[PDB]
Amino acid sequence: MKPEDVIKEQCARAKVVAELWHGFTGGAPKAALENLVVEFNKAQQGRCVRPVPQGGYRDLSTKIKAAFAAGKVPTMAQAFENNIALYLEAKALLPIESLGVKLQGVNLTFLNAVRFGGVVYGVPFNKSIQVLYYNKDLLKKHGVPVPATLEEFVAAAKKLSRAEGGPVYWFQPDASTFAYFFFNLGGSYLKDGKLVLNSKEAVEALTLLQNGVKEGWAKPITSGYINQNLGSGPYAFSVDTSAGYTYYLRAAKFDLGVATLPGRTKGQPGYGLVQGTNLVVFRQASKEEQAVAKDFLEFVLSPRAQAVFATATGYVPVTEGALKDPVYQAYAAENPDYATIVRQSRYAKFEPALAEWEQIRFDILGQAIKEAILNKADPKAALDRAQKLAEDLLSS
Numbered sequence: 001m002k003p004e005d006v007i008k009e010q011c012a013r014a015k016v017v018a019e020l021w022h023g024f025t026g027g028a029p030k031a032a033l034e035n036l037v038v039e040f041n042k043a044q045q046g047r048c049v050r051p052v053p054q055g056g057y058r059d060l061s062t063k064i065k066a067a068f069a070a071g072k073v074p075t076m077a078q079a080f081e082n083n084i085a086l087y088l089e090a091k092a093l094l095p096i097e098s099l100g101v102k103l104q105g106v107n108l109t110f111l112n113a114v115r116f117g118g119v120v121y122g123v124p125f126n127k128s129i130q131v132l133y134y135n136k137d138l139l140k141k142h143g144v145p146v147p148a149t150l151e152e153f154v155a156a157a158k159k160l161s162r163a164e165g166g167p168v169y170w171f172q173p174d175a176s177t178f179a180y181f182f183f184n185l186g187g188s189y190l191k192d193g194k195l196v197l198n199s200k201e202a203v204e205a206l207t208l209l210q211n212g213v214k215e216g217w218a219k220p221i222t223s224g225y226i227n228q229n230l231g232s233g234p235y236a237f238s239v240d241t242s243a244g245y246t247y248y249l250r251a252a253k254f255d256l257g258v259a260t261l262p263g264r265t266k267g268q269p270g271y272g273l274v275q276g277t278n279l280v281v282f283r284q285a286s287k288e289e290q291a292v293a294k295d296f297l298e299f300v301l302s303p304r305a306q307a308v309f310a311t312a313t314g315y316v317p318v319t320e321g322a323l324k325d326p327v328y329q330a331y332a333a334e335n336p337d338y339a340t341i342v343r344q345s346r347y348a349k350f351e352p353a354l355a356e357w358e359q360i361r362f363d364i365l366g367q368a369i370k371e372a373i374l375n376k377a378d379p380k381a382a383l384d385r386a387q388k389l390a391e392d393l394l395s396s
Ligand SMILES: Nc1nc2c(ncn2[C@@H]2O[C@H](COP(=O)(O)O[C@H]3[C@@H](O)[C@H](n4ccc(=O)[nH]c4=O)O[C@@H]3CO)[C@H]3CC(O)(O)C[C@H]32)c(=O)[nH]1
Pocket: 023, 024, 025, 027, 029, 057, 058, 061, 080, 082, 083, 126, 127, 128, 129, 174, 176, 225, 227, 228, 241, 242, 243, 244, 245, 247, 275, 276, 277, 357, 358, 361
């Protein structure tokens, strides 16, 4: 008997069912979402939220587009900020303050990102930040301090790769990893409102990663998550989502560390990319389904729900009230990694909120990064190609 089974029974006895389409495939994120929905459904009479896994986030956005063409949308779904911009073109989303959900106390980093034309269209729910994961044992073995600067981080990667005979900074050749280096070399994606993928800082960021591969300190991870590759070869560092935390803990045969990101100087951590999702509410939903969603959104923003979800997963608590919750404070008192995730969350940058950004980040930018890293494409050539494909897509 698992939470998916409890929910099936809850929804069988409900007159009103609000479907919540998500991209959690398993692990602690899926279990923590199901536990929240079980607790919510217990407090209802004749109403329930039914979580529906749609595969990953890419599959979820595909399924939502198909659902619009079919006229069969769920009540709620997870959405990135760019997915919100796309659904607003279709006038598909209900303004959250029209349901009367109170948003006071939501982190303005997250709430500003869901505001379009001054109107809030999503509820931050599962919001992640990049952190520096590291191998405490391996850095201890060689007396290497946790690097606080990008210059320190490259030096440490070089030193430890030479010592252990293989590349110890592991990375996915993807848009998320590129964003870390790009933003911390002073990059910006929007130049006077135009999307630019081929700026000098983009070229510098991709060149830094390609050079790290060539110099023997950076290891491209081509199959699976970094946490699914641990155990083969020496590992010192990765720059990866906070929502990876439980996956790294389950996989690591070494003592896992979590640090803030290396920055240009010791005066501030590096910026991390904010990922994970908001909850949106579809206009097509019934008034009765929308009233379940209102309740469910006030519940997800409650300090206890945030405290339990964040401590279960490594997601960033999205409210001030969550950090004052005793369950959150008890976990943080025993495990400094929670406070590290919160500190890092203060130094946060977003990708562009363009309707076309999901296609661009994977199929255009992500492909240019893979060409340069995996096929030794010249960085500037690869990003020049990415710029022209993005401009053609944005024109079309
Ligand atoms: N569709 C679409 N996806 C986007 C967009 N912007 C960014 N991303 C993706 O957000 C993932 C980060 O979201 P986050 O919720 O922080 O982390 C996820 C999982 O990544 C992570 N996970 C799962 C299994 C595992 O072994 N290890 C692990 O870390 O846990 C969470 C739940 O699955 C990145 C990863 C990516 O999927 O490859 C592409 C990136 C967008 O605009 N659209």
